[PDB]
C-alpha positions as a printed Julia matrix, in Angstrom:
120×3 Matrix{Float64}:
   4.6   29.45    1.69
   4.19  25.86    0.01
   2.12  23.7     1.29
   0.01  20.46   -0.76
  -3.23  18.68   -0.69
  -3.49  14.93   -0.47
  -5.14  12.57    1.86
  -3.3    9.48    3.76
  -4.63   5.76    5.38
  -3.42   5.58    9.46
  -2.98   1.91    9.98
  -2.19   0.28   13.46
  -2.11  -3.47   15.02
  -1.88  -4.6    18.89
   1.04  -4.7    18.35
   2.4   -1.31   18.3
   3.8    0.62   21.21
   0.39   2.22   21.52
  -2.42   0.29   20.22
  -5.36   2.99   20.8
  -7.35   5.37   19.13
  -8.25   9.08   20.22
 -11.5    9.02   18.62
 -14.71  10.88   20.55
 -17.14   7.66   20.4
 -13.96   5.5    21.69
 -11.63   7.42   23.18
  -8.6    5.93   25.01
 -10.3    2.66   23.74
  -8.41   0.16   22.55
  -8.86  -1.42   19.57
  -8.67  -5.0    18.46
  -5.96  -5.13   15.25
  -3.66  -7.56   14.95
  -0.49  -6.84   12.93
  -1.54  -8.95   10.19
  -4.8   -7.08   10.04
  -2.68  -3.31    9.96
  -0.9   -4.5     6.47
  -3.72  -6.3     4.94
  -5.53  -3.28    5.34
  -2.87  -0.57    3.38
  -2.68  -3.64    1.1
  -5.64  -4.44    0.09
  -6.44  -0.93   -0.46
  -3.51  -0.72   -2.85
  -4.68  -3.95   -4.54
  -8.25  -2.8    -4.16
  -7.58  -1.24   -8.28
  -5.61  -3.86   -9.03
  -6.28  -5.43  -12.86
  -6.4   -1.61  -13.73
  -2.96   1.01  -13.05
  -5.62   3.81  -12.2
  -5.7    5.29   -8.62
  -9.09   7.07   -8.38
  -9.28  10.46   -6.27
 -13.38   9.4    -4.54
 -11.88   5.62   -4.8
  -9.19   6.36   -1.74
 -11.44   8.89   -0.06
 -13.89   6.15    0.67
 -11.15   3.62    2.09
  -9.55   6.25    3.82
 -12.01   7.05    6.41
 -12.87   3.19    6.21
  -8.64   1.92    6.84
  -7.41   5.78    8.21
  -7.96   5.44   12.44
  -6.55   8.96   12.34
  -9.66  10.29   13.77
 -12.03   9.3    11.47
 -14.72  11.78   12.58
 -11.67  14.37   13.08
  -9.69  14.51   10.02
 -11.37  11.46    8.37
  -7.9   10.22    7.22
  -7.92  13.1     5.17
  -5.05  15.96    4.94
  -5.21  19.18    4.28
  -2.95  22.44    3.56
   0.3   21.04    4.78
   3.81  22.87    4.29
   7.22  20.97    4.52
   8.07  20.52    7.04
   5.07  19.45    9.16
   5.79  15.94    8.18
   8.07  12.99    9.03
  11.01  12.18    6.6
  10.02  10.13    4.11
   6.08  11.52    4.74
   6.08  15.11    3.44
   8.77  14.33    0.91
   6.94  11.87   -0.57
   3.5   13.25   -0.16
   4.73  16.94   -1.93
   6.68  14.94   -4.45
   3.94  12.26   -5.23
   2.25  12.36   -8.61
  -1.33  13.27   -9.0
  -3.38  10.23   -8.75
  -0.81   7.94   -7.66
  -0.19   6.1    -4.0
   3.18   6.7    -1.94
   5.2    4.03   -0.7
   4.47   2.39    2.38
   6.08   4.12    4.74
   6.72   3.1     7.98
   6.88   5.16   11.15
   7.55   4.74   14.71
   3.9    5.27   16.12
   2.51   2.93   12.48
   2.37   2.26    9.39
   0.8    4.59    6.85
   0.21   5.34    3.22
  -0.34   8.85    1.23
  -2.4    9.64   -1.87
  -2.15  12.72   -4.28
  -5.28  14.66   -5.19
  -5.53  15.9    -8.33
């Protein structure tokens, strides 16, 4: 009935309870993040228009599918028609109530770590 069009970064580190990636080059493969590198990288990106309180639309779409390990060559860290509910708490309440060209917090979930981004 409602649903909302943003994109979102998937970060991971060894770490985790399952440090993998489904991808179709590397599937079950493991992949070599360390939990310093899985904030750095949701950091940096928020950082990465620092000097300047402007999020970009094409500015996150080009670190998401560089950060995102959400299937890059599946959904390329990028979301599409999503209703609430589809979501984790704190995920699709932030991601539908998020303000067009502006980052969500970094939320935290029990498979990673992840951020959201509104399209405008």
């Amino acid at each position: 009935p409602t649903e909302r069009h943003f994109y979102h970064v998937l970060v991971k580190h060894k770490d985790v309870r399952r440090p993998s990636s489904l991808a179709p080059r590397n599937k079950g493969e493991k992949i070599t993040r360390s939990r310093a590198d899985a904030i750095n990288l949701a950091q940096a990106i928020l950082a990465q228009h620092k000097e300047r309180k402007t999020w970009s639309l094409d500015e996150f779409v080009q670190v998401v599918r560089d950060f995102s390990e959400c299937g890059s060559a599946k959904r390329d860290g990028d979301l599409g028609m999503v209703e609430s509910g589809t979501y984790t708490e704190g995920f699709d309440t932030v991601a539908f109530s998020l303000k067009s060209g502006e980052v969500s917090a970094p939320v935290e979930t029990e498979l990673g770590v992840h951020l959201i981004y509104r399209v405008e």
